[PDB]
């Protein structure tokens, strides 16, 4: 069983580079993530000797 | 054969300039998920001692 909480801290930038508009900037921030995995596995095994 | 759920509120911060009028935009999204993961295996080893 495994869950997964992970926060992605994200930033941009925001340029722009016309004739008529330009203006530049940068960005920052957190997002969110929150999980959940159940996992199911069998084998099998046959050795001679 | 496992499932992953992953439940998120993935929020970003962007602030925007222009020429002569700034504004800013922030967004967050919930969403839901079945990424299931399924697998086959074969296998074989030969020792010797």
Do not use: K, M, Q, W
Not at 7 to 12: A, I, K, L, Y
Not at 13 to 36: L, M, Q, R, T, Y
């Amino acid at each position: 069983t495994s869950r997964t909480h992970t926060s992605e801290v994200h930033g941009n930038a925001e340029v722009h580079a016309s004739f008529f508009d330009i203006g530049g900037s940068v960005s920052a921030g957190f997002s969110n993530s929150n999980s959940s995995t159940v996992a199911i596995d069998h084998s099998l095994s046959l050795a001679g000797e």
